[PDB]
Design a protein around this ligand. Sequence first.
Ligand SMILES: Nc1ccn([C@@H]2O[C@H](COP(=O)(O)OP(=O)(O)O)[C@@H](O)[C@H]2O)c(=O)n1
Length: 221
Amino acid sequence: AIAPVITIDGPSGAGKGTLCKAMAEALQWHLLDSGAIYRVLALAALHHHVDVASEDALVPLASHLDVRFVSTNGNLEVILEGEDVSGEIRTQEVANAASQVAAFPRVREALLRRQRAFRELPGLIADGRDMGTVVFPDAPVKIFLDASSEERAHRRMLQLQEKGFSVNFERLLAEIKERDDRDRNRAVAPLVPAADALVLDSTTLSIEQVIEKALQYARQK
Ligand SMILES: Nc1ccn([C@@H]2O[C@H](COP(=O)(O)OP(=O)(O)O)[C@@H](O)[C@H]2O)c(=O)n1
């Protein structure tokens, strides 16, 4: 046969990570965190002293990327050149370089096959920005998860406060809107929902409500 795919695209902080984890465990399917791929590439670029603003330098790197994602266990592992870098790919230095690296056409092309190879029995839950528009446009189920920038800033703020970091609302809001513009105003694979995508706005919905509506739509298809 051929493996079914559910694509979940959306902006930063929309809750994609949580939803993809809940669905993959519910359905007992495979999970693809596409953002982690651009993040590992960026980190390997930072470590190997490759200029992140140079498409020519990045290609040999993207095409020779030694990385493994260790099979869901309950928590996910990202292994770069044999080292577990799961925590390091989540730092600001990496997320920043990742947006630059992601903006190159030839870099994105070098990563297509790698991503598509995740589609396997019994199915794939793909998390990203362009899963339903570029990598899996043939996806039978497409969901575009969104939320207001103000709500997303508030959510990020409460997270930081739980960890004991000082932050003020105004800066978080400016930071997420900048991430939005770069994602949406991107010339290559910009953040735009698929024509056949279920637009799911979580602004005033709880995590359980998002999950429930997601799995119902998916099963009803
Ligand atoms: N399918 C994807 C996934 C991520 N990305 C980029 O990867 C970088 C970060 O991935 P992420 O979504 O895991 O983290 P944030 O940028 O939301 O902080 C972002 O700059 C995204 O635009 C992409 O271009 N295409």
